[PDB]
Every structure is written in structure tokens, then in C-alpha cells.
Design a binder for these strands. Structure first.
Lengths: 105, 97, 80, 92, 100, 80, 97, 106
DNA sequence: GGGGGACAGCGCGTACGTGCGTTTAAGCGGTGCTAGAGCTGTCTACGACCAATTGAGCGGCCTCGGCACCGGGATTCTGAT
DNA sequence: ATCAGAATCCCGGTGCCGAGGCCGCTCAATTGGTCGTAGACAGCTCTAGCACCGCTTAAACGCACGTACGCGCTGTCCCCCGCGTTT
């Protein structure tokens, strides 16, 4: 009748996350507010990643977000690079950076 | 004759993009990378919550366990803001019952 | 056939100058091929172990990303 | 010197696979032949292996570059790669 | 007569050979306990500590510092020097990825 | 009180000799103390979080082992 | 008035020690280190077996899952030595079953 | 009657490992030969560790295993150094190793 | 108090960057087929659960002997010769 | 090469306090029995992996040439170090 996602004020499926946690064999009993908190945390992370991807998309005048925007937006942020340290992005690369001794004199 | 039903979040990814950027589109491999990121973060938080529940000899995971898991896994203010809003994401979850 | 020479020294040159190197020695390529052979001798062996555990012989991309995340190199991309 | 740094600046923006996929696929099949005979590979598996190996060696190359810069040099040496693998823990 | 003085570096290698075959804590226990309590005072006040926790923290910190000094010495030897430098320390840290 | 002077110069000297350092510069001690502060402010903060989840105000060694194995520094010792 | 009934392997490791080196003792600190080592490697193998069971979408862990976990986690000849001793242990357990 | 440890001839317990696998929230269904396999693997790893520790103790003329013997045993073996890479051993140290350029000049 | 070591300056030359002819096979793309990944049905042997039983695992005490500690002989680098 | 001189290794006297053996409890392993259920196995299908081959050309091999940086050497000046004394 009424979904738990809109009752919690979020949009991600709370029932799908709760079903994944129940048969994911993490605990014998799963609480009610824990998948809601998980959905809120991953929704905030998704919003931050997508808004930084939109920043990188309007940097290079692109109306479609590509993983190049994700690569340029996951490494410029110090906190996201600290969290995602050994994370490899497909069709990615490195930031444009050149050392001072490599510059011409 | 379909083979099987997929288990992803691409429609929810597009909806989140529509709330954040109403005029900017997405590509397919970007949604695949984003879904892989979602699954990895979900597995990390679930494994941390399971380990923390096993540390305190508890077979039940509540919101406090996953709050502590979010605090431990995420450095910076990204946990602390998620300390606040996720809590009120609990609260209007409880206020709607 | 030995295809370790298929990684040509212009390709290693382009990869090294991609990383921010302006002068590359001639002996860089041999150790680069050796490190690549070690990495492809570990990760593909782990993928072979997964595929043998799955009662199959076709190496999937999800076994590859499983081998990559097992060694600490998380990859977002093919497979999911 | 100038054209090398110019294509360095071009290549810090570009994202294509610099390794040609057919010799890399042949090398992957050659290495996998030693473990299990008569093996098949999905194309996405080969592309993921290529991307991850390229990213790992680019990280090794920039570690080698900063090691050589630290050694009051600009031309890289195999001993910089050895030191990077030793400190990184990738050297057995 | 002049006193018997050893060469500079021979004594240093002598205590390297002595300390590479030792299993004692070089850091004193009570200043380290004061440092641990001072650090924990920043996060939460009136916190109590077990002595085993302080000893485990001291052992882990000493092992991490020994590994950091080993990598710093490797960087200094790679830079054709016998004296370590702070740039060797930051080089070993950024190769190890410990700098965020 | 401040205990930055608790990590004395002979203590860092002995830690460098155990690490096999022939000659120690004078500026080694400050960065060594800073790296020690960074490692302690990570591990002790994780231990405080572990203790705060456990409804306790006493920091045990088992939470220290939890905080050490969370960061990848596996320790076999006190606590278990 | 005892406090609690703990869990450790003080008898088993000493039994293997007297099986191999009958004239060699061991301290309690080394006992704690060895028990922590056994518990940590047990946790690693159990997590690998659970992840491999979820990898095949299976709710059952058989001997093949822990065979693959030993083949993956352990390098060198110790992996195939453990595989051989585990196969002969399984056949001698089922023969005595 | 007969325990599963003596049934398989293994010193390490089987019922304790099976109970820890069942109550450890690892899987819904737990096999029977897998605890026997795990007990055999733990027994061989323990035997190898104590064998190298006994070799280090007889090298140092000691009949009791100190953690310095464990440090000299684990880090000298290349498989134990590779597998237990990030493992910190309490009350231990490092292997005796001095670099060639740090040696005194003759 | 000082003396070896970090650091700065300068020449050697050679080893790698750069340019171009040439060869080498990489890349794109239709075709078939076929081994095999996956889906569907069945029924079955293997595992979770309930309860009584026990014997090995663990708390407490002890007494002893392996290693901690001291000094004097011998060894072994080590600076001055 | 060659000298004595301090640092350290080793052996005997001894002592002392954790370590394994013993006593005794007690609680989870063991076993019997039962019912649920996930997967072993076999057909059936449909799909992409592989092999193939022709056309175009991107790019590597390698030679010629050059020049700029590793590196050997030399000079310099000073930074910790070994040692003595005090907290």
C-alpha cells in the first residue's frame, strides 16, 4: 500500500536494502532503523558524488555525465580520495599534475 | 523470453540525478560504475556492522551499530553530517508510523 | 607464443610519460614487463581458481574484479 | 624535451587504453595457458584486466618518478622501481 | 694521555647491532601513558585505560616507527646518503600512502 | 599537560637504531613525533569510538586490537 | 566463585607441540600470541568461505569452498600441502564415519 | 563415545570449530567435512609455526619459546613473511639485517 | 672538539630524445558453429532442530626448574702504531 | 702488518616466580530421531567466444644525429657524535 521509502522521507528502496541485509548473513535479527540509516548514508554519498560529477560536467561543457567526470570529481576532493584510496575507476586515469622540477626553466 | 531480472539501482541513480541535475544526462557505463560503488559501500558498511555486532556479542543489528560503523568507516565530516541527517531520517521514519 | 614482447617499448613509453616521466631509461621496459607478468600471474591465477570453483572454464569479468578486490585494488566498472 | 612534455600534458587528459588489446589478449591467454588448459575469456574480463593493470603500472610509474626526483635525478632507474616495490610491499 | 675515543659511526653501528637483537620498549612507559591519556582527552573526557592497552599501543607504535625508520633509511640509501632526512620520511609516507 | 617532550631524543634515536639508521638528522625527531601523533590520533580515536559503542568509559586492550585490525595493522598480543 | 568459562586452544597447541618437540616449552605470552593468530586466521578463512558461498549464490558451505579458500589465501607449497592433508582427512573421516 | 577429533586423528577440535562456524553468522547451512578440513589446516599451520619456533629456540639454546623466537621464525620464512605481511608480533623485533653501504669500510 | 658527510660546482660522454624511412601486424568487420553458461524439473541425501548424557575444557593450587642476574676469564674488533 | 684496550660472549653460582601437572567442577560436544530443503543431475536452449580472413592504415623498428643530464671528481663548511659532567 504505502512504501517505507517515502514514509522515511528518502527515495531508495528500504525494503530491498532490508531484504539484502536479512539474507546477507550479517546478523540473526535486523533492526528497522538500521537499513533506513544505511539508505540515508548511501543517498547522501550518491548526492555528493553526483553533484561533484555535475561540477566536473559543467567544467568541460558536457550535458551528459561520463566516468571522466567521476574520475576528475573523485580525486580532487581530499576526503573522497582518502575514503577511496585504492579504488580504480574504469575508463579513468590520473589528474593533470606536473612536478616543479619537470617544468622547463 | 527474458533470461533473468537484474538487481541494480540505475533507475534510482537516474532519479537522484534528476533531483540534483534536472538538465544533465548520464551514460550507461557511468551508471554501472555508480552501481558498483553503491554495492561496494553497502558491502563495506554491512560487513563493518556485522563485525561490530559480533564484537559486542549481539545477534541483532540496530541503528546505533550502523551509526558507529558509519562513524568508523567514514573520516571527516561526511560521517558527522550523516550522524545528523540519517538520525532524522530515522525520526520521520518513526514519526510516520 | 611468448607475447611479453607484445608490450612494445613505445607503449611502455606512452604509459610512463602518462604517469609524469620525461626521461625513461632503456632498462625500465624489462622490469616493467616483469612486474606486469607477475601481476597477470597472480590475478589471472586467482580468476582461474574462481572459475574452477564455479565448475566453468570461461573467465568472467566478475571473477576478475573479485581477484582485484581480493588484493586490495577495488575496481568500479564491468561486472558490477 | 618540449614535445615530450606537450604529449605528457595531452596524455594526462586522455583516457584510451595505450596497450593494444590483441597482444595483451594473447599475453593473457599465454599466461592463463600455464594454469589451466583450454581456457576461454570474456571480452569484458580482458578489458577490466587491461584497465586495472594499466592503472597499477601508472601508479608504479609515478612512484618511480617521485623516487627518481627524490634521488636528485630526472631519468628513472630500475632501482627506483625496486625501492617503490619494496616500500609498497609488492616486492616479495 | 688522550682518552680512548671510538670513531663516529662505529658506536652507532654497535648500538644498531645491540638493538636489532632486543625485545624491550625504548619509549618509557609512564610518559607514553601520559601521552595516550592526553590524546584520548581530546575525544572523550574521564576515560579509563587498562595497562595492557597502553602496552599494546606502545608496541604497535614502536613497530610502526621501526618500519618507518627502515623505509626512511632505504630512501636515504637510495639518495646516495648515510644520513636520513625528513624528505626521506615524507617520501616513504607518500609511497606507503599514509598521507591523505 | 603536553607530552610531546615525553618522546625524548634518545627514544627516537633508539627507534632509528632499531630501524638501522647510520646517521640521524636533527629534524628527524619533529616529523617522527608528528607521524606518531597522526598514527595515535587515528588508532586511539577508533578505540574511543569502539569503547563508546560498548557503553563503557574504560578503554580495554580488545578495542585497541579492534582499532589496529581496522586499519590493517594486525597485532597478536594483549587482549586477543 | 569462577568468573566465566573462556574459549582458548591451550591444550591443543601444547599437544601438537609435544607431538613435534617433546623437550620444548612455551610461555603464556606466546600462548596468547598463538591463540590470537589461530583466531585471526580462522576468522579470515571463515570470511573467505562465507564470501565464496555468497559468490556462488549458495547458502551451504561444503568442503570445496574451504578447499578454494585455502588455495586462494595461502601461497606457496603450504596451500597444496593443506589441500592434500585435507583430502586425506576427509577420506579418513568418512571411512571412519 | 568417540569424538570427531579422534575420528579424523586431528589434535585440533572439530565440535568447537563447527559451533563457531554455525554461530558465527557465516552461512545458513554448514557442512560436516569443512570443520575437519579447517581443523587439519589449523593443526598443520600450528605445527609449522611451532617447528620453526623450536628451530629458532634450539638455535638460541632455549627450551622455551619466547616471542623473539617467533619473530625470527615467521619473518625468515618467505611464505610466513608473505602471508603475515602486516602482522605485528608482540614482544618481538626485527631480523638481524645491516645494509651493505651501512657496513664499515675496510 | 671535529671530522666525516651533505652539499655545491664543473667536466665527460653517452645514452636516450627526436625525426623519418620502413615493416609489422593492429584494427574493423561479416560468418558460422559450437561448447558451454544458464534455465527448468525432480527427488534425495545432507543439514537444522529438540532433548538426555557425559567427559574433556577450564578455574584453582602448587613446586620446581629454566631462565633472570652477577663477575671474571676469554674473545674480538678497533684505534693508534 | 702490528700493538694493547675496552665492548661483549660465555661459564659457574644461585634464586625465584611463571608453567605445566594435578584436583575437581560443568557445560557444550555427542548421539538418537525427525522433517525441511538446497542442490546433484539431466535435458533444452540460445549465445557469445573463437576461429577466420580481407582491406586500411596506426604504429613500431631501427638508423642517424644530437645534446643534456647521470656521475665521477674536487672543494667546502658544518652537524651530529663520542665522550664527560649534571639533573
Amino acid at each position: 500500500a504505502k512504501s517505507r521509502s517515502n514514509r522515511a522521507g528518502l527515495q531508495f528502496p528500504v525494503g530491498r536494502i532490508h531484504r539484502l541485509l536479512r539474507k546477507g548473513n550479517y546478523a540473526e535479527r535486523v533492526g528497522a532503523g538500521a537499513p533506513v540509516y544505511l539508505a540515508a548514508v548511501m543517498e547522501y554519498l550518491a548526492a555528493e558524488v553526483l553533484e561533484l560529477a555535475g561540477n566536473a560536467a559543467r567544467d568541460n561543457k558536457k550535458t551528459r555525465i561520463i566516468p571522466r567526470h567521476l574520475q576528475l570529481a573523485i580525486r580532487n576532493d581530499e576526503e573522497l580520495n582518502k575514503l577511496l584510496s585504492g579504488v580504480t575507476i574504469a575508463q579513468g586515469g590520473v589528474l593533470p599534475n606536473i612536478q616543479a622540477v619537470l617544468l622547463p626553466k | 523470453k527474458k533470461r533473468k531480472r537484474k538487481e541494480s539501482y540505475a533507475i534510482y541513480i537516474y532519479k537522484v540525478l534528476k533531483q540534483v541535475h534536472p538538465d544533465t544526462g548520464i551514460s550507461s557505463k557511468a551508471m554501472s560504475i555508480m552501481n558498483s560503488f553503491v554495492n561496494d559501500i553497502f558491502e563495506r558498511i554491512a560487513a563493518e556492522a556485522s563485525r561490530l555486532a559480533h564484537y559486542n556479542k549481539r545477534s541483532t543489528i540496530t541503528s546505533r551499530e550502523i551509526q558507529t560503523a558509519v562513524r568508523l568507516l567514514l573520516p571527516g565530516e561526511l560521517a558527522k553530517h550523516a550522524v545528523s541527517e540519517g538520525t532524522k531520517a530515522v525520526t520521520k521514519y518513526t514519526s510516520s508510523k | 607464443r611468448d607475447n611479453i614482447q607484445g608490450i612494445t617499448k613505445p607503449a611502455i613509453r606512452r604509459l610512463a610519460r602518462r604517469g609524469g616521466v620525461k626521461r625513461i631509461s632503456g632498462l625500465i621496459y624489462e622490469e616493467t614487463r616483469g612486474v606486469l607478468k607477475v601481476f597477470l600471474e597472480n590475478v589471472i591465477r586467482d580468476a582461474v581458481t574462481y572459475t574452477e570453483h564455479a565448475k566453468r572454464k570461461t573467465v568472467t569479468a566478475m571473477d576478475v574484479v573479485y581477484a582485484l578486490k581480493r588484493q586490495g585494488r577495488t575496481l568500479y566498472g564491468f561486472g558490477g | 624535451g618540449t614535445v615530450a612534455l606537450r604529449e605528457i600534458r595531452r596524455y594526462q587528459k586522455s583516457t584510451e587504453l595505450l596497450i593494444r588489446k590483441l597482444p595483451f589478449q594473447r599475453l593473457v591467454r599465454e599466461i592463463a595457458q600455464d594454469f589451466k588448459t583450454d581456457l576461454r575469456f570474456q571480452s569484458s574480463a580482458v578489458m577490466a584486466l587491461q584497465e586495472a593493470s594499466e592503472a597499477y603500472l601508472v601508479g608504479l610509474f609515478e612512484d618511480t618518478n617521485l623516487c627518481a626526483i627524490h634521488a636528485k635525478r630526472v631519468t628513472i632507474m630500475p632501482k627506483d622501481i625496486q625501492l617503490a616495490r619494496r616500500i609498497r610491499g609488492e616486492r616479495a
